[PDB]
Design an enzyme around this catalytic site. Structure first.
Site, PDB file in Angstrom:
ATOM      1  CG  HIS A  84      51.896  55.637  13.290  1.00 45.80           C
ATOM      2  ND1 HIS A  84      51.823  54.556  14.200  1.00 45.80           N
ATOM      3  CD2 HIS A  84      51.635  56.518  14.012  1.00 45.80           C
ATOM      4  CE1 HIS A  84      51.789  55.100  15.910  1.00 45.80           C
ATOM      5  NE2 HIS A  84      51.868  56.471  15.645  1.00 45.80           N
ATOM      6  CE1 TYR A 189      53.289  53.527  21.371  1.00 44.94           C
ATOM      7  CE2 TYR A 189      51.027  52.875  21.401  1.00 44.94           C
ATOM      8  CZ  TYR A 189      51.964  53.048  20.648  1.00 44.94           C
ATOM      9  OH  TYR A 189      51.738  53.514  19.713  1.00 44.94           O
TER      10      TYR A 189
END
Ligand code: ZN
Ligand code: ZN
Ligand code: ZN
Ligand code: ZN
Lengths: 264, 264, 264, 264
Positions: A84, A189
């Protein structure tokens, strides 16, 4: 009425706050910022870097390496927790300026190769310059540099290629088992019925078990607050740090609560 | 006394024996050779190809697609079992001549990208032209083309990215559950204590269980003899074919015997 | 005093202003925005797209393709002028949603593969999601789709892989020679003694000559104002458009003036 | 009647004949075979390798590097003439075992990335394990390692990315201008009207001029016989070597004769 302007990845102030190298063991150093972990391991045959932080941290990391007597060409290898933007950001620039190689597993390698774009959860919202992995790593594989052995432990969840690294250092001659475990969070998420990640829940539950069993005397995380580290206080930075058991237990309790209100 | 000459990947005669398209269901066709499976699935929006065989089979596959009324530009997608030379061989050429996309998981994608070189077990001995995957696939993800849904089932072992594909076709209107399962063999592998694949045994044992539970009325394998198919006899080709249970059971018995004499 | 925040690529308002498809010839359509050229060419075997604009234009381009009766799977090929963010932006997303292939030369291919990062002049300041080219193009090579032949003309300068495309369409039956020439500008470049591009001046001077000799009855540029196009007025959009000779002459006069004050 | 078996790239015996390191200047060494040039340049900050020969030469090159006191981790950079199998063969393996980076231009980078497959003239007949370039090189760019400066000179023809390298060494203190020029041959190429390389003749004629003007006191070629080198005789190896003028003149006379009988 036109199309919206591109918006950049803005982070908290303490994520970009430079700090001087903080010692963790005889050869392990925190050279990132106050809220972003970047670990330097010095051996007799070169240095190893674990994570790098935000993309704009490349110059700061080289300054701290220089403070430890590590020239750029002495950096032999870059290891990653997950690919990331806030942890693999400067990897592409660091490869150009040091001649180091990057080792990661296949899932981290393909995400690194596209600069974090087409993320399973974030899409193209959080991108960074692409970089290519030079050596592909399998679960349980040992990577040796200068006598220090690094063992990879796959823990899919936060990203499919999330990885924990374990190695044994010393504290004035006596050994210490260091474990650098990745994030166990799911910030926003979709857990259940995700089309891009159909077995997300199964991967998370198994990773909680993986982190509990890790051989660890001292735990570090990419975000230091996740393991109760406070890099700002220096000598007392590891005083309140969590165990692998406590870190995994708190992650599962937050994951279960998030999964419960998703059904709601 | 010089250095040895490069030796090419020579296979059995029946692996390169062209055959006419053999029908498996209302839309599923075997268009490979007698000893190599290449499955064509025709839909209303285009064709899907599963595996391609040896590299020199690219022209033969296009001839058989033409025999089914499938122009090259009608090939929409290529799926793979695993990225070895005898099954992904012509993928690079087929992409150039059809404009199709390739979908595979991360492990198959990185092995495909380097043409099978630096194989965990074979090294550079069995190579083929490299190809890049266009879409990365997760375990349990569904791929839909023309209404036919393909579900990926990871089964690591023969290669880390080995994958089984399941879909439902029809036999004169009545449904049939087709399962295309990858190889469960370890031809010459080092099973125990392998440095390039530290958890090889654990991956194999879990894959045996995965293949047993697959939803399947009819099983096909990349090598037809592994599931007791005989493409040469045409109408009776599926007469003696095995079940998913029998196929997995025989693979585990051979794997256990090989693991027993490795300790010897 | 921390490190600076990442700043995004903000453009003028008219670059992101959606417009309806404007006709250029019997098969050539402008489907981009008012200040960004995105050319659609419809043939009997599929559609061709030349450039795509900003990354956030992917949805708009598919809406205009749908307005012309072009389904996503009908897009066969994407061609590029140069691989900067304001012209190759949505290429990665368009590949995922259409199954098209991308053809470009080697210099454009490597810049496209790293999302415009490590630009010779801009560094990492203007990035976009990476995409991979499927077919590599040589200078003077002809690309044929549905009977329409596209010829590539290398014109290095604005980027090393800058490319002009020529093809013959019709205007109610009578032929017309269309030339899509790339930018000939150097916005803020270091022309003389550039270490990243030692022969920048020689490449520019040769490209001016290349654009003068292009077979062209009608000239279009990635930025319409560079060739005196005004997409906003619709029917009179090509009224004041420049010739290939005038476009190259004005570029060289601005390049010479910029080169003169750089020595100062 | 099946499909033909794959045939491997078999070369002459003297191409695979190991030889001990032969000295060319104070820091330049030939460490390849008798008929394949592999140049090692030793500096104060590491070693540079130019070409590597056949794929099966990786172990031999490391043995000769060890004979010069060069450990694998001391190899900093690999440069290439062109990315064919008999000169870039072991590059992928050498990267894995040394941690070196590869620098090449865009055309060589894309051919290297696909292992020489889909060659413009040879197709897939002569392949080798793929490798990725770490730094992209422009024409006239200078690459510095340990104080020794390497300058790239593009000479397209034998391959689109063919490159000549120039640097200044010493001979017992006095300087010498070394030029490593690529092949100027077209073995079996279609010169006129080639669809994969429309401007092949123009590129060759310009490369002849480029090689004539190269700053050179001593010329070396990937195949030593092309510049009249005889590595076997050791001390007299450079006695009959050609000039840059003579080498380019003989190449153009053979190219013109081949072009004349192609029209026939
Ligand atoms: Zn993250
Ligand atoms: Zn296999
Ligand atoms: Zn531009
Ligand atoms: Zn060659």
């Amino acid at each position: 009425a036109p199309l919206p302007q591109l918006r950049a990845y803005t982070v908290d102030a303490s994520w970009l706050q430079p700090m001087a190298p903080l010692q963790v063991a005889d050869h392990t150093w925190q050279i990132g910022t106050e809220d972003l972990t970047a670990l330097l391991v010095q051996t007799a045959e070169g240095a190893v870097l674990l994570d790098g932080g935000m993309p704009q941290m490349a110059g700061h990391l080289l300054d701290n390496m220089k403070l430890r007597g590590v020239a750029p060409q002495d950096l032999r290898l870059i290891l990653l927790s997950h690919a990331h933007a806030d942890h693999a950001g400067p990897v592409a620039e660091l490869k150009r300026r040091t001649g180091a190689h990057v080792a990661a597993n296949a899932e981290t390698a393909v995400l690194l190769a596209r600069g974090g774009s087409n993320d399973l959860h974030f899409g193209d919202g959080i991108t960074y310059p692409p970089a290519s992995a030079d050596r592909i790593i399998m679960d349980g594989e040992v990577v040796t540099v200068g006598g220090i052995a690094f063992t990879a432990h796959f823990m899919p969840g936060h990203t499919p290629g999330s990885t924990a690294w374990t190695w044994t250092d010393t504290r004035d001659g006596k050994p210490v088992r260091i474990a650098y475990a990745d994030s166990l969070s799911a910030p926003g998420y979709q857990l259940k019925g995700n089309p891009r990640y159909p077995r997300l829940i199964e991967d998370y539950k198994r990773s909680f078990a993986t982190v509990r069993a890790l051989p660890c005397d001292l735990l570090l995380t990419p975000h230091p607050g996740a393991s109760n580290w406070n890099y700002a206080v220096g000598s007392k930075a590891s005083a309140e740090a969590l165990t692998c058991n406590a870190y995994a237990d708190a992650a599962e309790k937050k994951f279960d609560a998030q999964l419960a209100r998703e059904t709601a």
